[PDB]
Design a protein around this ligand. Sequence first.
Ligand SMILES: */C=C/C1=C(C)C(=O)N/C1=C\C1=NC(=C\c2[nH]c(/C=C3\NC(=O)C(C=C)=C3C)c(C)c2CCC(=O)O)/C(CCC(=O)O)=C1C
Ligand SMILES: */C=C/C1=C(C)C(=O)N/C1=C\C1=NC(=C\c2[nH]c(/C=C3\NC(=O)C(C=C)=C3C)c(C)c2CCC(=O)O)/C(CCC(=O)O)=C1C
Lengths: 486, 498
Amino acid sequence: LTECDREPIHIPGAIQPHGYLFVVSETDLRIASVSANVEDLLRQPPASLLNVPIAHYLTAASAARLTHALHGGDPAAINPIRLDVVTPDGERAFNGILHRHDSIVILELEPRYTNEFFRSVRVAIRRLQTAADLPTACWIAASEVRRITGFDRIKVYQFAADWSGQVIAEDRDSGIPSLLDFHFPSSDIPAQSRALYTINPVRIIPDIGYRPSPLVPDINPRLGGPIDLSFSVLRSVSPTHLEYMVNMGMHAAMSISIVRDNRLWGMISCHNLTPRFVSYEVRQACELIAQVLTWQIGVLEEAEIVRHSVRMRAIQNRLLHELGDEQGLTAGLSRVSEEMLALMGASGFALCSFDGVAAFGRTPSDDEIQALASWLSHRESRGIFQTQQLSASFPEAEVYSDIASGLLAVPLGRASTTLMLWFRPEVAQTVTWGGDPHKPVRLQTRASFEAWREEVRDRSRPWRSHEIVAAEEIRDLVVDVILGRA
Amino acid sequence: LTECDREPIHIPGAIQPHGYLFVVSETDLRIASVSANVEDLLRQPPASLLNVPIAHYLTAASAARLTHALHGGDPAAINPIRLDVVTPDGERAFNGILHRHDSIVILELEPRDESRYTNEFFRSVRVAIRRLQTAADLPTACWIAASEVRRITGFDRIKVYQFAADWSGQVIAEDRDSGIPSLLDFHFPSSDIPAQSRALYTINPVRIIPDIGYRPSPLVPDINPRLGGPIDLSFSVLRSVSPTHLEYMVNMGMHAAMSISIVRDNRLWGMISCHNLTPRFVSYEVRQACELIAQVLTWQIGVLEEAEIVRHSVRMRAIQNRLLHELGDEQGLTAGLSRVSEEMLALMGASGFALCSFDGVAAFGRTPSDDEIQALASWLSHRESRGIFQTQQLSASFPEAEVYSDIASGLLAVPLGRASTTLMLWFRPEVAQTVTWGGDPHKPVQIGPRGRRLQTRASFEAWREEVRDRSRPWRSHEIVAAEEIRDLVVDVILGRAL
Ligand SMILES: */C=C/C1=C(C)C(=O)N/C1=C\C1=NC(=C\c2[nH]c(/C=C3\NC(=O)C(C=C)=C3C)c(C)c2CCC(=O)O)/C(CCC(=O)O)=C1C
Ligand SMILES: */C=C/C1=C(C)C(=O)N/C1=C\C1=NC(=C\c2[nH]c(/C=C3\NC(=O)C(C=C)=C3C)c(C)c2CCC(=O)O)/C(CCC(=O)O)=C1C
């Protein structure tokens, strides 16, 4: 497990030959380190070229652009820089991808779009923005990716709390295999890969079986440690993970992080049969989709709540009056119980006092919710508690599996414990993974990615964010009436 | 027309007889005043009920439901309240709409118009909302709110009306039943919803006139038991409205009207106006969902705006890049602009732009003469603002620009510094557009019998006008790329101190 976490993926001393790197002390822009693969391009030796002014390499026009872009700077949205390299053959040019990190400066060379193009992306974005829900937004995101990257398969993979994931949307060309609901374990994106991706959000491997060029030399020329190659686009990628890809059987891979409030939310993973490369530009457009999709994630969240303000208004009104006039509160509840229970996805709900309990629907008896309450107190919040699987973190609960696998708990008090608990019952479901996910490898890639299935119990259906808000708006009501009457 | 503005619509002495008003001195909730039409429900007469336990008129449960609602105090979202009124003739059930104002309590009773609101209804508004939220652009979204409103209120015609800088507006979306006359795109003058109306509508967002030919029951009496003045029915739903307007409506062919305000950043943005040929009433519960649609619509306007921006990062990011690299790297900034000009212009949606200092001018595209921009910029200096300036008709505020109207009626002026010495101006040329009106907008009223200024004009047929002197509207997103372009010019210029 944690052995997977421990590799340095950021320092390999190597790259991907579909491009050419350089490191520079900037003052006159002297090549402080360069990559092996350079020789096929200028036909000269390798360490010879160290401490050499880059500029005589660059057509006049080009060289000047480089220098400016460095302090060009506004707003470090200088990439890509169109360069032309002076050479033995004659006129041939590049896209240049420059960055600074750890007091050294890196420049990478990569291969070189119209009014028709922007429009393609504009409409990508429109569709995404007008998506009705999250599953649908993800799909639009997958295909618009697919459409503009020409890849055989796009997946939107979203992390679960445990850093296991699930492919929640896919789009593939006719005659390409599918991973469309598959889960995969945390081993698959180790804690370090993950954390790198949270700040470097796009990466590509245009041929998964590349010829790794190393660096002449591999040292930081101004701080003298290992070269930290994190924000290099050409940074050669862990061999571990590499065979992994011939295993899936895809001869190219790209992926764009989905980052949401600085926590990685998921990835767009992209697979093609033949090797394939697409220009920086397209990856940029991809990242801009990925971005929009991230933003949408929340607007869909706000929207889902609104869609449901209506029962809510109505129910408030009823609930209000129906509790309003009766000579008991506890009574007043019973009457609206069902529509409420129905509003929440729920089979039952309790109110546990220090001094008793009021139970409604499918719940555990009076004795044991007070047990449940007692337990709730310790948790490292006095805010809402929620889960689909109670017994995961409360093994005393495996018994209510049948009727409370899922619990929503809302305190009335600002930090008081007199609570409203909503229960939901088990719902068995079947999840499919890569292979025996109890056998994910530490060592190399596991052999197989064919569907493997597993029967989960003691778990309720997920709590939707908006049902939570209604719990709250409901506590808000019982709170008021509870107050109004002393 | 400031007299049209002076008619005080919140102090009539009457209500609309489809409902019954009250007002109560509050402890024992004794009745302090009522409307004439009360007579029809309780064969007794006004004064026989003045100052009495209102609850004497209610069932055990209703009275308490009311009383418990008197400090209901769950927001003021207690409305409507099921009241059951005891009567001579058989039993009578009302929707009760309680509110406080001018130091008193007012209660109104309106017809319950589902004896049950259902699960089918909830889904209908849910899908109304989903649609409204997934709209592609402001028009479509306006339209959606219209049809969905239409689906649940059933009125023959639903309009979305959007106000402009002068309090004229135009119908920008409409949905109607077959064979109902269309006022889509019709402009209307500010006179038609006069200032005071607008004000009330800004703080009171829904109103209905279920029959435009009603017999206004007045109130016995019209004295506030705590303030003794005339009674304020501002937030009374039942409030008999201006008769000026009432005539507007027969003159319009519609014997019922409901309208929900669209209120955005505490300014009246527009109205959803609903019209039916023959009278119609719709229940409190139904108006409330309409208001809910409007609010979803109100919010959606901004999401739409934001969305329109995001959609345009790409030309932007591009021009940004080509710019940085192409424009720094040419040995003039002037020279740089020269190049990226058309794309810029194209992104800007503009025929021309310049960069005048106090000490020079750099013009690109089709612009005014240098002398003429040099003067624009002086004038721009006296304005009391230092931010973006925008007009579709420059000559309206700067009449000396009439001359260049043909090539710059629209100006988007954006300052480099906070010191507004040197600015980047974008030009757009007058454009022909033909717009159509309610009636002639040049006599928006006529003198009524006895010599006053309150008659609605006789007709709302298309009147058309050719307008040639105003440019294309400056769009929110366009302004943004201007700001962004500015930001780039700045770096170069800064970068190049020396
Ligand atoms: C503990 C070693 C590893 C096991 C076992 C394993 O399965 N992976 C292991 C290490 C790494 N994976 C790296 C990158 C990476 N992994 C994925 C995994 C997926 N690709 C998919 O398409 C899906 C699901 C549909 C999954 C779960 C991706 C997308 C990536 C990023 C690159 C890409 O595939 O496009 C990785 C990082 C190496 C590095 O970046 O240097 C390691 C170490
Ligand atoms: C200055 C005298 C008035 C003229 C002339 C006039 O046209 N209106 C005048 C006064 C009032 N109008 C009132 C309410 C009101 N007006 C409108 C106007 C429109 N309705 C439409 O559908 C369109 C265009 C398609 C327009 C321009 C509306 C919508 C309303 C609100 C009621 C409704 O929905 O019909 C008014 C207020 C009376 C009150 O509320 O007491 C006054 C005084």
